[model samples]
Target: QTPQATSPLAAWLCYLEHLHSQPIELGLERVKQVAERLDLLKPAPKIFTVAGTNGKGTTCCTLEAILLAAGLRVGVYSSPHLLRYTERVRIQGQELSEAEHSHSFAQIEAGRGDISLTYFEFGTLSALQLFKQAKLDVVILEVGLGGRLDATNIVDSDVAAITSIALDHTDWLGYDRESIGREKAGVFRGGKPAVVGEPDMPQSIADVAAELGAQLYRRDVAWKFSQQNGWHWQCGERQLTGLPVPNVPLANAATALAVLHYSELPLSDEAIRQGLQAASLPGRFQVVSEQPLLILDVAHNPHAARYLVNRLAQVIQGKVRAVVGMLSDKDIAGTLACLSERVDEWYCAPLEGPRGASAGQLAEHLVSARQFSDVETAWRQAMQDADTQDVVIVCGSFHTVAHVMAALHL
Candidate 1:
């Protein structure tokens, strides 16, 4: 625990990394114990717990932006940061400082005595503790993995959201969509508001929501959002017209609307429109350069890959060259298959770390694939080969986008 005499944030981060031997131990017993000791359950008055395979980040980001724009101190905690650890926690739409992170970590360490918490568990506790002290009007939490036993599930959310779910995290969340849907619905509390963006949602979610007595809001059911003509949102008698297309995916934006609607927060059309235009997370279809376009996306799962393909169709008018890296556990073949028709060339690169997939393994999933030892090399090749009318998309994992963001000086 560093003895509290001399402990830097960097050192604390290192300690948190090795706190538990297993990278991912998905039970909530240890974390729940520590959270109870710290009194971190129900930290904020308004809590939006988001869970899903894809679109979690975008939905959380959009929710944060809208709530913050409405003059509320919104705290958001998301998972698997791209570059910095501080990216996981945001207060009033700003990332927490190094000192804040260190202090939170230190507090967790001091309280957690003999209980060993996984890295994710520790981080979740730290974020909750920080938000508890911040006196935020609203807090949004993006579930790191499957929602049922996830560390974030310890808190009872006032509102729960499940963005588009797909066949990712097959081992932990189960291989089928129905199983995953049921697990992700864990955030929903009795008589609380819940929103799901998936149009073709599994019946398991409905069953669970019914059993929990949650006010389950499904796409085209309790509320509806239309993207055909400039986007709009409608719920019962309330309707918002002429809303701008959000920086994130339109589906996630719509889901965020439903969440906000059910949350009963300060609702204004101006704030919602402003948030739609302003809310953007890095590396989610982010455009780096325009002279010769280069886009970045952290789309590793097949569902997100399908979204990326649709986005490519909407934005990229010409050829697309993909510089992608993925983790070994992901559905490599399914994800690649989703984007194969849209991408003209594939520049498969090896990602770093034990979970990272090798370039050879990535190339094996593609028909027209070239292997590169490093992501930078593949990105360089993609940039050099793509013409003015072409786009170079760096994607498949957060690490892939972060590495390219470093290489491109973003």
Candidate 2:
């Protein structure tokens, strides 16, 4: 059955937003019941659920790319998309149609009956239906936030990975690394393979993994990858040499490779290399233009912001300016404080939404920043001020990068 009369994609999205009173009510009871009704809890043959303060997107992207190269039909579900809502769900590496999304959304709507679900919860169910209908060989899901009670945790993961432990989403996850690490470790299932990218992983993560009896793979201790003339990775007797630098973070690529090795799957060295070369997700150290250098990223947290300083230094040598905007809930001061000392100028702009921070509000953190009414205006002005040798970065919130990408027709 095609559920109800099909609604337009926009209308469907709006309907989802109003389904619940709160945008993020993190718990599994409502989502689990809805999943049971829809039978989406068991959708794919293999599932990889990734959770972290940062780097989960890159890790998921790398895993999806590699698995696809191994001739597996892959389905991906990620969140807080930069451009369209459709970007959140993908099957076989392609965005499914609006008609497809509408149909599945309608199915979930009908199945839920009177149950209230947040927008994210509704979309999670919709993706599961889509993945099952596609009959994908493998499914990769990125945790929307902390993993313990995230809607995606309803489906057990065959392999799970946590990219980095840092502070963000403090309101829900907690104030410190130990608290957040424990929450993120919730995706691990007993006897399942779990990888942590951080070398000095918090005790909380170790405790949870021990409690669940998950086979833990720790970076540095369990495996290591390095770039020197070319990239090289070593894990036990397994080693790969002369591989191209993957498009994701070094640790993220390494973690994804570890997940592949631990899985009950066959992959050739050639396929691994091909996957490394093919892996790429937008808005992560992405270079747009060459002459008047422009880079786009969605690094809005303190951990990611600090990492950006290293990335910018490695790739860009020109004078650097940043067009920044942020949500009110994020660590505005901490994030900006990490990079402000390195950036030559800051073009602060307002992010419009209930949780948005005004340009003036953004400037409060970095008094040296100049205020712009909108991201586009801020971006264009940065373009005007920059020379051929100058590098401009559009970043902070995903909203900030989306505006610049659209303005530049990216």
Candidate 3:
């Protein structure tokens, strides 16, 4: 049985966690059934589903900011929140209150009727229920994992996008780029706008999109962006010039614009400009301090690590100290190697849980690196060793960055 509406948000979350036997049950049958029973397949008039190895969070946030700037009510549902469970769902740029979450959980529990849903599945339905109740004009759903069987894929999105596919979740998705690309392309619907931002996209994506007859808007072909004075993006006959650079990744920003362009929504140039400028996520290259620059990023995979390396190259003033913790299954050696040349000192910390790699496990990669008990201590040690001009980066997994965020009270 599920918790009642009067139950606290934490209690509801706990119930959902243990609701299913397995933590991750991929395949949409169970979730789709419950969603249908609750009538949550259509959360808004227009829905955009985003799937990729990286950049999904930034793409969703950029879309929400831009859509809201246009005076439209937008809702976004993202996964693996940094701080609170409420961070997973946002309505009109604001997180929902505990009462709102609890109420939605109760409704989903009642509607489920003996159906067992994974924690993410329950959260996805809860977010959709809230969005449906709010009568939102647009809803952005970020895939929790691979697209094909992810719970969020239950809805046939108006525009589905894949923002830079890379090797991640290889066990569940696949081992190679082509295999992963096919899984990411599962969200595309027939005859709908399907956007791809990965410049080196695998042919499998094109194959799937073509099979579905999706109107493919591929990067470097259908749409392209250039950074000169500011940044310029052009798609077919339509284009935007002199746009402000977003703090988020440029490729994801371009994908967000493409998703909106094909969305058939009337977004003014001013709104687009303001949205890009206003879009900011907490852990995506977040700078918490100034003098001894403290940066936080969730660069768990090699792809995200490469981006982090490029970003760091632009702003490096002095020595770089890295405080990193990651999952055992990720390509830790490859990820660390991406930033190895720039990072002067490595402070390794173990994440908490079964999936987390021990500091010793990470030490297998960098024998010269120092090991710590936790991210907070590693962060503290890194800060203690850094000079005013030095940069300390806390990265690896979302959990690693979240730990530091709490330690700093950010």
Candidate 4:
């Protein structure tokens, strides 16, 4: 029976309550069973699974853009959409309509019966069904969490890509890069091609790929790219010359080349150039405006935060005013330390929801870390401090970025 919900947002809330309470589960058995029941074991079209601690979203976005540039129908399934839940499912680069979401939700509810599925599980199943129905040429699935038991891992992907691995989720995954690499490598299947975007990946990733018998493609080893000029990459066997550089261009280009090589997707040099120029993902060093250079990035952890700082140093010209927020569970001090030198003024605010850090809590952490500030306000105060001559960066977490975006209406 369909719930008499007035809106898709309300429907999502109802599903959240009706299903299991947790947002994550480390098993795929129940999801597999549901897939089988729904006859989703062998869906139409090819699949590409992307897993990693960071860069998965960028990789998926690049893959979708490239495939579409090649004139192929593409579908993408990603997690934890920054703005709307509908952003998790896309067909041909467009978000699923409310009708599509409702239909998929109904199908999942019918099959759910007494079994309680997590939010991720329900969303995963719905996206798979929608992709199957859409008759897409390719479907890119981004791993929501650890790969071994992530709902996206249930399907055997034609190509599996693992981006950089770091120590973000230590409690559930492990305390080191090696442990996390193994978990991410779980998406690989025998004889299928696997791509690792990080040049200096842990040995555990290579070991896991070897054990799985997956044809491994490591960045800087199997595939490499050189910058021809500004916003252009000269990849081995594929030239994206003179294309506008997308956010995280190198990582995205490497992943797209790896997938194209494995899938044997034929493309002209011009097509590659167009795809590279067209690829984009929000919150990854995304520049929303130019005058006084406003950038938004979702770098919540120390590892990603370090990268952000490095990129800013390379590209930014003047003093930087940072708008940062993060959850209480994150590596707050470590993240702050990464930006300490580059950040001239910090506009820290309380994040919304249970997972977020309150303004006072964030202030305490910053003070304890030796960074002193007296001005206390929410995200709006930070935006007010930004000027045209100074660089403004909004980052720390997706939730934080979203809240700030809402306040700015950008």
For each of the candidates, the C-alpha root-mean-square deviation to the true structure, in angstroms, is 2.0, 2.3, 1.7, 3.2
TM-score of each: 0.95, 0.95, 0.96, 0.90
Query: lDDT-based ranking, best first?
Result: 3, 1, 2, 4
Where in model 4 is the C-alpha error above 4 Å?
A: 1-9, 21-26, 170-173, 231-243, 365-380
For 346-391, candidate 1 gives per-residue lDDT tens digits of: 9999988899999999888776688997999999988888788998
Off by over 4 Å in 3: 22-26, 169-174
User: Candidate 4 on 1-410: residue-level lDDT in tens?
Assistant: 24632346566656566754565444787888888889775555688999988888888988888788888899899978787788898898899777778777778768866666787888899888888888888899999997988888899999999888876632453578888888899999899999888777999888989998999988888776655454443336754445556666476667766787778877766666677778888777888877678788999888788888888887763578777777878888778878886887777766667887765676565543212132123434544655667787888889767765665556
Candidate 2 C-alpha lDDT tens digits along 325-403 = 9898888888998988678899999988899899999888786878998999999999999889888998898999998
Model 1 weakest 10-residue run by lDDT: 1-10
Error of 2 at 295 (Å): 0.3
- Candidate 2 lDDT at 394 equals 88
Residue 183, candidate 2: how far off, in angstroms? 0.7
lDDT of each: 0.87, 0.86, 0.91, 0.76
lDDT of 1 at 5: 22
Off by over 4 Å in 2: 1-5, 22-26, 169-173
| Strongest candidate by TM-score | 3
